Amino acid sequence: PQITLWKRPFVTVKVGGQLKEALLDTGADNTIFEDINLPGRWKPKMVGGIGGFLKVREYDQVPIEIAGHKVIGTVLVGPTPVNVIGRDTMTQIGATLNF
Amino acid sequence: PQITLWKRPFVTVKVGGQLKEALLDTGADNTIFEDINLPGRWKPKMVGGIGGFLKVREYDQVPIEIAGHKVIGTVLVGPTPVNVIGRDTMTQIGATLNF
Numbered sequence: 001p002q003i004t005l006w007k008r009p010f011v012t013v014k015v016g017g018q019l020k021e022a023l024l025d026t027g028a029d030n031t032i033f034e035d036i037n038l039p040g041r042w043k044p045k046m047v048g049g050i051g052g053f054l055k056v057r058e059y060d061q062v063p064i065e066i067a068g069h070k071v072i073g074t075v076l077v078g079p080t081p082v083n084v085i086g087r088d089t090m091t092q093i094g095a096t097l098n099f
Numbered sequence: 100p101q102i103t104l105w106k107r108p109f110v111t112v113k114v115g116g117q118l119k120e121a122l123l124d125t126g127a128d129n130t131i132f133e134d135i136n137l138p139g140r141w142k143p144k145m146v147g148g149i150g151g152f153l154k155v156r157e158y159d160q161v162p163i164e165i166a167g168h169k170v171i172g173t174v175l176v177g178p179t180p181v182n183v184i185g186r187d188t189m190t191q192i193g194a195t196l197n198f
């Protein structure tokens with residue numbers, strides 16, 4: 001699809017077997033969710049942004065379906081106010097900005 | 100242009116009289132700079148991000164040039180780690196996210 005930006009660009013994704021919504025974010029390096037439970041091991045990571053840093057769990061090679069496509073990549077989990085799909089995932093579905 | 104997302108999507112912008120660079124950020128509501136100086140009075144404003152809330156200066160009706168499109172918008176000046184072009188400016192140049 002072609003998405004205008006008059007509203008925040010959320011999309012449906014499936015991760016860990018659950019349907020979630022997340023913000024398509026061209027400014028973010030990373031992909032992060034609040035309250036999803038993933039299997040397998042994780043490693044601690046800190047991510048920074050406006051206002052400071054977030055302590056998260058990093059899970060590697062996680063399948064995400066976004067809203068229709070299969071991506072495998074890194075997923076962060078921590079107490080974020082919003083789920084975000086960052087460039088690490090969006091490059092794998094060929095997302096582009098156009099103007 | 101049509102911009103892929105393998106690198107961070109920075110663009111050249113002229114804000115006030117000054118050439119700067121900033122991140123095209125579909126996950127940001129606002130346009131925020133740290134390294135510009137704008138004249139005159141400003142209004143206090145608070146913005147949120149992943150880590151908490153920051154105090155910024157709001158300057159109204161500021162000219163912004165990006166990719167040859169000259170627009171007039173609200174520019175915030177605050178302790179952001181990265182200059183960001185948010186959806187408020189991107190909608191004015193007709194930017195879309197596509198996949």
Ligand SMILES: CC(C)(C)NC(=O)[C@@H]1C[C@@H]2CCCC[C@@H]2CN1C[C@@H](O)[C@H](Cc1ccccc1)NC(=O)[C@H](CC(N)=O)NC(=O)c1ccc2ccccc2n1
Binds near residue numbers: 049
């Ligand atoms: C933006 C922030 C998330 C705070 N990250 C950083 O500031 C990291 C932190 C790292 C650990 C501590 C020591 C410094 C390194 C490198 N910095 C990068 C920082 O010092 C450096 C500033 C700079 C820019 C241009 C020319 C010279 C210097 N940025 C850079 O070199 C490149 C610029 C680019 N176009 O990619 N940017 C980044 O490295 C950077 C990293 C994460 C980001 C996440 C989201 C959005 C933008 C992000 N930009």
Ligand SMILES: CC(C)(C)NC(=O)[C@@H]1C[C@@H]2CCCC[C@@H]2CN1C[C@@H](O)[C@H](Cc1ccccc1)NC(=O)[C@H](CC(N)=O)NC(=O)c1ccc2ccccc2n1
Binds near residue numbers: 032048054129179
């Ligand atoms: C989410 C995460 C992966 C941690 N990445 C980032 O946060 C990186 C960090 C980078 C270095 C510092 C400068 C910003 C860049 C780009 N950001 C992405 C960037 O897109 C980021 C994503 C985001 C949105 C909403 C809430 C939190 C976080 N947007 C923002 O930080 C913008 C800033 C603003 N006020 O315009 N925030 C918002 O637009 C915004 C909207 C609604 C909100 C509701 C509650 C609380 C905070 C809310 N913030």
Ligand SMILES: [Cl-]
Binds near residue numbers: 019020021022083
């Ligand atoms: Cl959700």
Ligand SMILES: [Cl-]
Binds near residue numbers: 029030047
């Ligand atoms: Cl990020």
